[PDB]
Structure 1
Amino acid sequence: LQCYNCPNPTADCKTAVNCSSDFDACLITKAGLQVYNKCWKFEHCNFNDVTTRLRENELTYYCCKKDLCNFNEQLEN
């Protein structure tokens, strides 16, 4: 399950990379103008398992089951 992972929440990250094991759902969150592109599990794909791990509250999140599915262009702005 490959997934994108940048060192900062920017809206122009085009670097793909394997997210090791422990990941079955790419995650593309967009809390306003910050785009969080990190790998995530499907069991934790809810409106709380992602707002608690990141320690945040206002934000979005779309899980994907395809290698490199988070490329800034799935749920729209």
Structure 2
Amino acid sequence: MLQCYNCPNPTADCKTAVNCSSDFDACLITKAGLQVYNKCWKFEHCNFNDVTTRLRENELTYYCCKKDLCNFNEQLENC
């Protein structure tokens, strides 16, 4: 099992850490304008088309990682 930040809704500063279902093999962080998402995710869905369609977001950037709690907001907050 992988631990990821997983907030049910987009929010600033997602601190909600969870032990993801074993089927989730990656952690996702995505910024879609004002909406920032942090989820338990899958690599098969770590592509622009799958992230946009599934979060129903027209434009965004995303990042997937495989270490516990890796999907925090460092990349956004350091900029």
Quickly name the TM-score band, shorter chain normalised.
0.7 to 0.9
Question: Does the CA-based 8 Å contact 1:62-1:75 persist in structure 2?
Answer: no
Distance in structure 1 (CA, Å) of the matches to 2:51 and 2:8: 18
Measured after TM superposition, the shift of residue 42 of structure 1 is 0.9
Unaligned runs of 5+ in 2: none
Unaligned runs of 5+ in 1: none
Structure with the bigger percentage of helix: 2
Distance in structure 2 (CA, Å) of the matches to 1:70 and 1:25: 9
**Percent identity between the two aligned chains:** 100
Deviations 1:14-69 (A, max 9, x none): 12111212111100001112210111111211110111112222112100011111
Q: Which runs of 4+ in 1 moved over 4 A?
A: none
RMSD of equivalent CA atoms: 1.8
- The answer on 1:62 being equivalent to 2:75 is no
Instruction: Describe the shift of the 1:32–1:73 C-alpha distance in structure 2 as closer, same or farther (beyond 3 A).
Output: same
